[PDB]
């Protein structure tokens with residue numbers, strides 16, 4: 001629980017979602033001042049922000065955005081460390097000169113964060129390029145844990161009972177059975193990779209969610225982005241394995257990405 005007197009907010013909205021807005025601020029730490037990004041709420045939204053805060057409090061990894069704390073003032077606020085370069089999709093739309101090697105570096109970082117989330121038995125449920133935040137052009141972190149869930153000790157998936165879902169990033173078992181696991185987040189990671197190598201283009205352009213479900217059920221998949229290495233398109237296709245049981249987990253994905261990244265680092269030198 002943070003002290004509102006130690007928080008200074010800038011009026012400009014950096015971005016927004018259903019929850020409310022994201023604003024820049026400054027928080028007075030024990031000695032240094034820390035630049036922060038603050039989610040400010042516009043019943044359900046409050047409980048959802050507190051649950052998001054409860055998830056973030058449990059996470060500690062270099063590739064996951066750190067929560068500083070929460071504050072109840074003019075509205076409920078979730079204060080995070082600031083990722084100065086903002087969302088990855090917007091960044092790549094604006095910086096088309098970012099190299100294939102640099103994209104591999106960033107998505108590999110996302111895979112390391114996801115490997116940690118999987119080991120931690122949390123499901124993200126909103127893994128998309130808009131939710132990867134850049135600290136620098138060479139350092140990505142995962143944010144936006146509003147749909148995330150801590151798996152029960154006796155289950156490897158979360159069963160949704162009820163909603164407004166990011167359907168183009170969801171695996172077939174999410175749509176068909178409402179079952180969310182770390183393997184479902186792997187499918188989303190495949191879509192995130194496609195977005196990254198497409199420089200922030202939207203996936204399944206011009207298609208309704210129902211048309212996407214129909215396409216995937218026919219065994220069809222999005223094509224290879226221009227300039228995307230064959231090895232990376234191969235990995236996207238493996239993430240898009242229909243049967244959740246034969247789809248790789250994040251330890252297998254991160255290892256494949258790590259090895260290819262070292263190969264490219266070797267080709268560069």
Ligand SMILES: NC(=O)c1nnc(N[C@@H]2CCCC[C@@H]2N)nc1Nc1cccc2cc[nH]c12
Nearest residue numbers: 014015016037080081082083084086130131143
């Ligand atoms: N820690 C953070 O910086 C941070 N964390 N989460 C989120 N969530 C957003 C929700 C709304 C949609 C985008 C995101 N998914 N936005 C953060 N910053 C941020 C937003 C927007 C612009 C900029 C420029 C620098 N930073 C920006």
